[PDB]
Point group: C3
Chain length 114, copies 3
Amino acid sequence: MIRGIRGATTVERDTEEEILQKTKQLLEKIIEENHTKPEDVVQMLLSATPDLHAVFPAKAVRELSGWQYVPVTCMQEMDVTGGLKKCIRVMMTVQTDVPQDQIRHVYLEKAVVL
Amino acid sequence: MIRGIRGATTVERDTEEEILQKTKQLLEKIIEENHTKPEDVVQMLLSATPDLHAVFPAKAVRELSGWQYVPVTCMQEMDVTGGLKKCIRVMMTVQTDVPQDQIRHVYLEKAVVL
Amino acid sequence: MIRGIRGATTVERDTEEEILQKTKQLLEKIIEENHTKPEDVVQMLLSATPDLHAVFPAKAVRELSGWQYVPVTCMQEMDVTGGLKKCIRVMMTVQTDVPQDQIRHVYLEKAVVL
């Protein structure tokens, strides 16, 4: 079946180095936990709160071996009063047999409270 | 097959109570009209126009029994001049064998003009 | 499987005619490259950079023959420093078993740089 996998991390500052590292990690933990092979990934959406402008998060995807063909695009997360700042969110769509309740959704850094 | 189900509604005021209630009521109608069960939902994206800041509309999914594992995320709608103000829209991706031309899309409140 | 197909194009004026024409053109190119049938399309997302406001680009989909049931929604792209201005990007989800590395993504106008 096809199921979404969610993740979220935070950056300390709006630099390219930080954003690509926090995203790359978030992506490795998702892969680890859910055994995602790049070819089972339908598409990925990455969003970032309105305070992040230094690089597209999508750039870290093509720093993973075998991931250069997975289609990824980015969106601006809505601005909510009191929402977690400098937060990058991923919604990955994958072909999996794993049941809905057993998907490992990943929250790292300041996102551990989402 | 897996198909997308669209919906839209509007709130009168940017208030958490108004946003969660009008969103819950739209999700309930989509679900009703299409006999959707939580385990068949791949994922769900909810958008809000740039004038709504009180709460993330995804907080309303919390009040639908059984939906606790359905992965949902939000995005900001683009700002079009003359677009419907105070509008929440949904794209729900479900596993279904209903023909494309028979998916029931739901437009409520002022969004009935879309 | 179901696979995402990415596209991107740019406009010269933020105007209804130019955003509708360049988006129609992007979509007609994706369909011809991927030999897409509307019944096989799960859904589609279109994002626009923060400088485009004249019309939603989703409106170009009703100019395509037979696409009146395809569920589409828009979203706002994040504003990246050094990013492509006046850019319209699409993520189309389709049912297909063409392997991932053989999907044809389309980059028109100033997006040929990608």
